[PDB]
Design an enzyme around this catalytic site. Sequence first.
Site, PDB file in Angstrom:
ATOM      1  N   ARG A  30       0.905  -1.137   0.000  1.00  0.00           N
ATOM      2  CA  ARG A  30       0.000   0.000   0.000  1.00  0.00           C
ATOM      3  C   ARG A  30       0.948   1.192   0.000  1.00  0.00           C
ATOM      4  NH1 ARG A  30      -2.463   4.288  -0.113  1.00  0.00           N
ATOM      5  NH2 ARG A  30      -4.535   4.607   0.800  1.00  0.00           N
ATOM      6  N   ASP A  35      -3.634   8.636  -1.431  1.00  0.00           N
ATOM      7  CA  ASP A  35      -4.961   8.067  -1.488  1.00  0.00           C
ATOM      8  C   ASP A  35      -5.526   8.342  -2.872  1.00  0.00           C
ATOM      9  OD1 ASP A  35      -7.210   6.709  -0.407  1.00  0.00           O
ATOM     10  OD2 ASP A  35      -8.182   8.595   0.096  1.00  0.00           O
ATOM     11  N   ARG A  76      -0.579  -5.445   4.746  1.00  0.00           N
ATOM     12  CA  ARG A  76       0.035  -4.853   3.562  1.00  0.00           C
ATOM     13  C   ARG A  76       1.311  -4.127   3.917  1.00  0.00           C
ATOM     14  NH1 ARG A  76      -4.967  -1.388   1.143  1.00  0.00           N
ATOM     15  NH2 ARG A  76      -4.665  -0.451   3.209  1.00  0.00           N
TER      16      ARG A  76
HETATM   17  C1  LIG Z   1      -1.666   4.555   3.735  1.00  0.00           C
HETATM   18  C2  LIG Z   1      -2.015   3.814   5.037  1.00  0.00           C
HETATM   19  C3  LIG Z   1      -3.218   3.209   5.176  1.00  0.00           C
HETATM   20  N1  LIG Z   1      -3.562   2.536   6.343  1.00  0.00           N
HETATM   21  C4  LIG Z   1      -4.866   1.887   6.497  1.00  0.00           C
HETATM   22  C5  LIG Z   1      -5.821   2.988   6.958  1.00  0.00           C
HETATM   23  C6  LIG Z   1      -7.104   2.519   6.363  1.00  0.00           C
HETATM   24  O1  LIG Z   1      -7.777   1.645   7.278  1.00  0.00           O
HETATM   25  P1  LIG Z   1      -9.358   1.738   7.561  1.00  0.00           P
HETATM   26  O2  LIG Z   1     -10.106   1.259   6.225  1.00  0.00           O
HETATM   27  O3  LIG Z   1      -9.640   0.725   8.593  1.00  0.00           O
HETATM   28  O4  LIG Z   1      -9.555   3.196   7.640  1.00  0.00           O
HETATM   29  C7  LIG Z   1      -6.729   1.769   5.111  1.00  0.00           C
HETATM   30  C8  LIG Z   1      -6.896   2.635   3.871  1.00  0.00           C
HETATM   31  O5  LIG Z   1      -6.479   1.871   2.756  1.00  0.00           O
HETATM   32  P2  LIG Z   1      -7.185   1.968   1.339  1.00  0.00           P
HETATM   33  O6  LIG Z   1      -7.344   3.409   1.009  1.00  0.00           O
HETATM   34  O7  LIG Z   1      -6.488   1.058   0.407  1.00  0.00           O
HETATM   35  O8  LIG Z   1      -8.609   1.375   1.640  1.00  0.00           O
HETATM   36  O9  LIG Z   1      -5.365   1.393   5.257  1.00  0.00           O
HETATM   37  C9  LIG Z   1      -2.683   2.460   7.413  1.00  0.00           C
HETATM   38  O10 LIG Z   1      -2.936   1.888   8.451  1.00  0.00           O
HETATM   39  N2  LIG Z   1      -1.474   3.074   7.264  1.00  0.00           N
HETATM   40  C10 LIG Z   1      -1.056   3.759   6.145  1.00  0.00           C
HETATM   41  O11 LIG Z   1       0.053   4.251   6.170  1.00  0.00           O
HETATM   42 CA   LIG Z   2      -7.509   4.234  -1.912  1.00  0.00          CA
END
Ligand SMILES: Cc1cn([C@H]2C[C@H](OP(=O)(O)O)[C@@H](COP(=O)(O)O)O2)c(=O)[nH]c1=O
Ligand SMILES: [Ca+2]
EC number: 3.1.31.1
Length: 130
Positions: A30, A35, A76
């Site tokens: 990720r 975003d 991820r």
């Molecule tokens: C970019 C990033 C996302 N995330 C998590 C937050 C979001 O969780 P929640 O859905 O529980 O809010 C999710 C967003 O990813 P996506 O935008 O791929 O869905 O990934 C982290 O924990 N750390 C990070 O650095």
């Molecule tokens: Ca996204």
Amino acid sequence: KLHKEPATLIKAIDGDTVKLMYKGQPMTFRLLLVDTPEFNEKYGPEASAFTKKMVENAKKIEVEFDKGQRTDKYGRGLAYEYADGKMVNEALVRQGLAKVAYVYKGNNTHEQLLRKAEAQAKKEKLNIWS
Ligand SMILES: Cc1cn([C@H]2C[C@H](OP(=O)(O)O)[C@@H](COP(=O)(O)O)O2)c(=O)[nH]c1=O
Ligand SMILES: [Ca+2]
């Protein structure tokens, strides 16, 4: 001082998620600090298309972990991705196909750089900022 590590493309998934082979193991990454819109939302296909083309046509793909967490709650990998020296995270932001987001304490080394790129796309009214 962060260090770039080698990786091989397994499969491009969407605007900010890609499956890569890192240290010999399949892993979903990720992208840090960004975003992109989901495929269903506006500009979603464009973001996915942008990332897909960028990594599939690269000769060398490198990952760069930050200081804080390396893995998220979903298992991820969290990193800055490079396609032939060019940072995919920044490129997406520069084209207005991604927004600076999810800035957590300790995993924001490249924050200013991305904010800079966002401000440029924002002033140029690129894609998302139209
Ligand atoms: C970019 C990033 C996302 N995330 C998590 C937050 C979001 O969780 P929640 O859905 O529980 O809010 C999710 C967003 O990813 P996506 O935008 O791929 O869905 O990934 C982290 O924990 N750390 C990070 O650095
Ligand atoms: Ca996204």
